[PDB]
Amino acid sequence: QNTVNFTYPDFWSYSLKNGTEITFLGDATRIPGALQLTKTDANGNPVRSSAGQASYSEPVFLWDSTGKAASFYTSFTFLLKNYGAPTADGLAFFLAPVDSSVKDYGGFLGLFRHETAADPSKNQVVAVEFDTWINKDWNDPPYPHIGIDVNSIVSVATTRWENDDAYGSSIATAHITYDARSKILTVLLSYEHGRDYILSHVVDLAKVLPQKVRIGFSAGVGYDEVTYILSWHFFSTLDGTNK
Amino acid sequence: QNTVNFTYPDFWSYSLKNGTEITFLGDATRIPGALQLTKTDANGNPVRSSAGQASYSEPVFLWDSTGKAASFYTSFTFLLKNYGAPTADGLAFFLAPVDSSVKDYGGFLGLFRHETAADPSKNQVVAVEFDTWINKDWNDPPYPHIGIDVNSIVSVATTRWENDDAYGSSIATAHITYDARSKILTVLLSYEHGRDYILSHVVDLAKVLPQKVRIGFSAGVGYDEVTYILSWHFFSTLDGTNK
Ligand SMILES: CO[C@@H]1O[C@H](CO)[C@@H](O[C@@H]2O[C@@H](C)[C@@H](O)[C@@H](O)[C@@H]2O)[C@H](O[C@@H]2O[C@H](CO)[C@H](O)[C@H](O)[C@H]2O[C@@H]2O[C@@H](C)[C@@H](O)[C@@H](O)[C@@H]2O)[C@H]1NC(C)=O
Ligand SMILES: CO[C@@H]1O[C@H](CO)[C@@H](O[C@@H]2O[C@@H](C)[C@@H](O)[C@@H](O)[C@@H]2O)[C@H](O[C@@H]2O[C@H](CO)[C@H](O)[C@H](O)[C@H]2O[C@@H]2O[C@@H](C)[C@@H](O)[C@@H](O)[C@@H]2O)[C@H]1NC(C)=O
Ligand SMILES: *[C@@H]1O[C@H](CO)[C@@H](O[C@@H]2O[C@H](CO)[C@@H](O)[C@H](O)[C@H]2NC(C)=O)[C@H](O[C@@H]2O[C@@H](C)[C@@H](O)[C@@H](O)[C@@H]2O)[C@H]1NC(C)=O
Ligand SMILES: *[C@@H]1O[C@H](CO)[C@@H](O[C@@H]2O[C@H](CO)[C@@H](O)[C@H](O)[C@H]2NC(C)=O)[C@H](O[C@@H]2O[C@@H](C)[C@@H](O)[C@@H](O)[C@@H]2O)[C@H]1NC(C)=O
Ligand SMILES: [Ca+2]
Ligand SMILES: [Ca+2]
Ligand SMILES: [Mn+2]
Ligand SMILES: [Mn+2]
């Protein structure tokens, strides 16, 4: 088939082999109940300078020459665990080529190589980043932020993420949707007894990514921080693109 | 304050007086556990030709002359109960002037008056409609659909709603978000063991609605159908509009 539909309500079924449903790259590992993105020592304490990725194993169809394009929705809950405030560097949900791998740690979030990070012509990746560190040198806004990245670590759009939520270590729920007809990517982040965060931007995936992509989570540290993905749902539809 | 934040996890607290938290107009009524939008007989059986609205009682700030504009997110679960297939006419989440009231029933969904429904200059309303009836005469697409309505019942954009979901009578969860910086309205509709529906469109609320609006649910019937709203959450933020 050309569309994908999966739901993982939790990850307490930690015994699946690497690469069969989810592929782990770099320092990302499967633990009981979670996809862990960067490295921790014996006590679950975060290591500095680490990067990892957990991605769905199958390729995801996005578009083809015949006009058919996939609209999609993904939701996931995560626990960004902080051991002080501030922490570094964050996490990201991404869509990249099937053949790509984890790249640099720190503020590049395992998605970019330091040398070509601010160069759109040298990257093929769209990511929604949940940034905990202000990298002054790569144009981060002066606060923790949520951002949409298109072929570069310098986000095409961002919205403020409050300190209390960014460094509070509570489980958060994210909803990311893409409408393939109007080329709109929307991010919704919610905290159970807190506030919501909304960020939407026009981006034509067909114009920046290949026809088939790999989807997943990528993180880069940094220090005093580690991200655990607790559940994940992905659904894509070709609705309205003549199919 | 200029922003709104409320959460109703369920409506089993049916004893609040009309107009204090929620205002009921037309045939909409408060019942144990739900906001009922149109009329039913003794047995909960749907009446033909009815319209009703349940709206938040306080005015909601949307924008002002000084550039400040509200981004928002609302979520709600609803049960669109069907007594056969097809049914008519649907429901809608809307934003209208504080002083407006319920209008015609049938395909106008309590939001428009038959005479001026296809005339944008005569209406001030933005609505996300969940349309169960194909009104050939008002340009409905040839299937049940979800649509975004801007000052007219003829939607500026729509996406297919499958027959099985539109007439299946299962509880569905909706997420509607508006980003005031990029002027994007997104609708996400999810069924627990089913599919998701995504529809997003650029619409500048500041350009079509007054500075303060009333928000709520509106329905119009039709026949063999009745909608119950089971929970409702609304959150708005001025984030990124210099405030
Ligand atoms: C003078 O540069 C600073 O040098 C140290 C040692 O090389 C860097 O910090 C170490 O490596 C980081 C990746 C991170 O694991 C950190 O905990 C560790 O001490 C430092 O990098 C910046 O550290 C920040 C946290 O204090 C944060 O993680 C930033 O993302 C990180 O900057 C990124 O990574 C560095 C190595 C460069 O590639 C930068 O272009 C990039 O933004 C160094 N700071 C600077 C400004 O480079
Ligand atoms: C010839 O027109 C048809 O006449 C009947 C009686 O006046 C209309 O049906 C009744 O009223 C409806 C509002 C609804 O309560 C229905 O159950 C009831 O029998 C009929 O209206 C259309 O009925 C459809 C369901 O069979 C559906 O509800 C449509 O939304 C409704 O059309 C709307 O309402 C009518 C009254 C007009 O204002 C239309 O412009 C509008 O789309 C009439 N059909 C038509 C095509 O008008
Ligand atoms: C899970 O399976 C992957 C293969 O599909 C592993 O990645 C591959 O690991 C090789 C080194 O063992 C490396 O040469 C390959 O290029 C790499 N594949 C990609 C796309 O990068 C993966 O290995 C982890 O991630 C790689 C990038 C290295 O950092 C390894 O040290 C890691 O083990 C496997 N993960 C695990 C936990 O087994
Ligand atoms: C809940 O309180 C509302 C007042 O804030 C009622 O609406 C008002 O009802 C008057 C008739 O009793 C009418 O003249 C007013 O114009 C109307 N207000 C608006 C904004 O329309 C509301 O009444 C229901 O809805 C109105 C439109 C009529 O259809 C009434 O018959 C309904 O009772 C009150 N709802 C209930 C259930 O009490
Ligand atoms: Ca950063
Ligand atoms: Ca209709
Ligand atoms: Mn950033
Ligand atoms: Mn319609």
From Swiss-Prot, chains A, B:
Keyword Manganese in record: yes
Pfam families in the cross-refs: Lectin_legB
Record bears the keyword Nucleus: no
Keywords: Calcium, Glycoprotein, Lectin, Manganese, Metal-binding, Pyrrolidone carboxylic acid
Binding site for Mn(2+): 129, 131, 140, 145
Glycosylation sites: 5, 18
UniProt xrefs under PROSITE patterns: LECTIN_LEGUME_ALPHA, LECTIN_LEGUME_BETA
Residues engaged in binding Ca(2+): 131, 133, 135, 140
Molecular function terms, GO-annotated: carbohydrate binding; metal ion binding
Disulfide cysteine pairs (residue numbers): none
Stored InterPro entries: ConA-like_dom_sf, L-lectin, Lectin_LegA_CS, Lectin_legB_Mn/Ca_BS, Legume_lectin_dom, Leguminous_Lectin
Post-translational modification: N-glycosylation of Asn-5 converts form Beta to form Alpha.
Oligomeric and partner information: Homodimer of Alpha and Beta forms.
Its job: Lectin which has a strong affinity for both the Lewis b and y human blood-group determinants.
UniProt family annotation: Belongs to the leguminous lectin family.
Note, other: Binds one manganese (or another transition metal) ion and one calcium ion. The metal ions are essential for the saccharide-binding and cell-agglutinating activities.
Protein name: Lectin-4
